[PDB]
Amino acid sequence: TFIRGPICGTDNCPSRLWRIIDGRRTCQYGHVMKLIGHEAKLLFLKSFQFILKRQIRWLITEMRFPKEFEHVAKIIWLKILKTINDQPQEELKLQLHMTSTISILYLASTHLSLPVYTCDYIKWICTAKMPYFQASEILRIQLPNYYVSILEGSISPFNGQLYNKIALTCGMIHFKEFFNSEISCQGLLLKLVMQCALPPEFYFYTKQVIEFEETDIRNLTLWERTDERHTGRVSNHAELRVLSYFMLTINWMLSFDRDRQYPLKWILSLTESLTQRTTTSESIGRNIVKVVYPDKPTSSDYFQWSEEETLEFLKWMEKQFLPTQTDQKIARRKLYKIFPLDSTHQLTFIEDLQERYAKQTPFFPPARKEAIGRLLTHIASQLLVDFAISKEQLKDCISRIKNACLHRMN
């Protein structure tokens, strides 16, 4: 017979009061009246490696990758794991930022010649589909705050941090003999023509300028481990040069159709079919990336979006910002439970692509340079948000490689 309370009114207990209905109250003898230190390298690399295999799970599963990728990842993460555990110091000196996760994913994908490119990764992670923006997301482990900072920090890929970290890894363990670091070029061309509404001739145009300056040899290292660089090496991440050739091609090609194959108008109609904000999975995505792109204008771009864009936005917020990070509690379960928590419309990708291909289907004088310019600058915008680089970065590259074509042409 228990209630614990009221100890015992006898100073050789206090032993433990139950009340009988008769009010004696009776006591038993029988009166009736934290985190690791300095080798959490091991835990660090475990949350990191665990987060990696988690992401692989999401891309074979949800992206229908091949199972071979995983082995290619154990090999690359194995090489650099072996290289950081061929390093002595108790001072950690490692940077396993998230850019390293994405860095070995892209590295492995590129060995395997899969037609995935950096912009696929940027989209995937900025749309909260592929889990990224957290340490062991809200649900795990308590580590030294020095390493939680080594994770949460350097999170952004958005100034070319991804290209720089994939080249950095490409030094950390060598691309050349160990792997095949040729990019999947021609699928990028397809991705690009379809990404505009360019007629399929430009695939072969740009493919040809490509062959003209390179003869199609494309590497992955830009490495001489440092920070320091100041010439020759704004433009040797293959992709960025591909986009540069693409832009150039459009400019040259269209401004020297002495044939007049490409109407003064169809460049405008192309610009407008490219400009018309319409709600497909893709453009909705590019809006989602526009939101976390560092520079204006792209945030003024979210300004010029429309009620349905904002709505599908809050949708993606309640879906993929459940991937958040980090008495009164039940008072907030009832408090929030005070207000209720609670023929397919928009079209697919090739549907939109088809319909603007038709919106220009009427195919069959110095201010047309204007049309060339505004088209080039819109295309540029899309590339800047999609491939997470800078205005100034891009134009540095296409400037350099444009002089790199004039030099091998003159």
Partner 1 sequence: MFEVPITLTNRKFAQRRKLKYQYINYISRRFDRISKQQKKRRRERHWRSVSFEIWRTVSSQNKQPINKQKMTYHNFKKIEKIPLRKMEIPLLHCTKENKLYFQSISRGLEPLKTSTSEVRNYRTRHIVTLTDLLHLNVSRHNWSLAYKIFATLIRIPGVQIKSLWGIGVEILDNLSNSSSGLDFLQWMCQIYSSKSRSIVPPFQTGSRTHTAKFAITYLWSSLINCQKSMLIDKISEWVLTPPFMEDAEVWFIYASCHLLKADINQVIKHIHYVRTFLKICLDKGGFAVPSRLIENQLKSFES
Among residues 21, 42, 330, 338, which is the contact residue for partner 1, using CB under 8 A?
Answer: 338
Question: For residues 25 and 32, is the Cβ–Cβ distance under 8 A?
Answer: yes
**Does residue 19 sit in helix, strand or coil?**
strand
What residue type is assigned to position 377 of the chain?
T
* Count of residues that interact with Zn ion, criterion CB under 5 A: 6
Toward partner 1, which CB reaches closer, 310 or 403? 310
Six-digit token string for 323? 């991937």
Helix/strand number for the chain, H first, E second:
17, 2
Nearer to partner 1, 137 or 355 (CB): 137
119 is in an annotated binding site: no
Nearer to Zn ion, 14 or 294 (CB): 14
Q: If binding is defined by CB under 8 A, does position 318 make contact with partner 1?
A: yes
The binder of 135, among Zn ion, partner 1, none, by C-beta within 5 to 8 A per type, is: none
- Torsion, Cα of 396, 275, 184, 133 (10° steps): 80
Segment lying near partner 1 (by CB under 8 A), choices 115-123, 140-148, 324-332, 393-401:
324-332
Joined together, the tokens standing for residue 247 give: 């832009």
Which of 1, 177, 342, 406 is close enough to bind partner 1 by CB under 8 A? Answer: 342
**Any idea what the Cα angle at residue 53 is, between residues 48 and 54, rounded to 5°?**
90
**Of partner 1, Zn ion, none, which one sits near residue 31, judging by CB under 5 to 8 A according to partner kind?**
Zn ion
The amino acid sitting at 241 is R
**Binders of Zn ion among 12-31, rule CB under 5 A?**
13, 15, 27, 31
Please tell me the distance from the alpha carbon of residue 100 to that of residue 191, in angstroms, as a whole number: 25
Contact assessment for residue 183 and residue 379, using Cβ atoms and an 8 Å cutoff: no
* Residues in contact with partner 1, shown as a per-residue x/- string from 74 to 113 under the rule CB under 8 A: ----------------------------------------
Single residue of 3, 7, 10, 294 touching Zn ion by CB under 5 A? 10
CB of 152 to partner 1, least distance (A): 8
Q: How far is the CB of 126 from partner 1 (least distance, A)?
A: 8
**Site track 261-280 with Zn ion (rule: CB under 5 A), x = hit:** --------------------
Is the CB of 252 or the CB of 302 nearer to partner 1? 302
Map the footprint of partner 1 across residues 115-144, applying CB under 8 A: 128, 132-134, 138
Is residue 303 a contact point for partner 1 (CB under 8 A)? yes
Minimum distance, C-beta of residue 295 to partner 1, in the bound complex (Å): 10
C-to-N gaps above 2.5 Å in the chain, after residues: 33, 139, 326, 342, 364
- Does residue number 7 form part of the binding site for Zn ion (CB under 5 A)? no
**10, interface contact from partner 1, Zn ion, none, CB < 5-8 Å by kind:** Zn ion
Per partner kind, with CB cut-offs from 5 to 8 A, the member of partner 1, Zn ion, none near residue 178 is none
Q: What CA–CA distances, in Å, run from 315 to 75, 120, 127?
A: 38, 21, 12
Task: Establish whether 13 is an annotated binding residue.
Answer: yes
Q: How far is the CB of 274 from partner 1 (least distance, A)?
A: 25
* Separation of alpha carbons 375 and 45, rounded Å: 46
Q: Say which amino acid occupies 208.
A: Q
The answer to whether residue 2 forms part of the interface with partner 1 (CB under 8 A) is no
Distance separating alpha carbons of residues 15 and 29, to the nearest angstrom: 7
For residues 235 and 42, give the distance between their C-alpha atoms in angstroms, rounded to a whole number. Answer: 37
C-beta of residue 220 within 8 angstroms of C-beta of residue 238: yes
Please identify, using beta-carbon distances, which residue of 82 and 333 lies nearer to partner 1: 333
Q: What is the DSSP annotation of 366-401?
A: -THHHHHHHHHHHHHHHHHHHTT--HHHHHHHHHHH
Footprint of Zn ion on this chain (CB under 5 A)? Answer: 8, 10, 13, 15, 27, 31
Binding residues for Zn(2+), as ranges, are: 8, 13, 27, 31
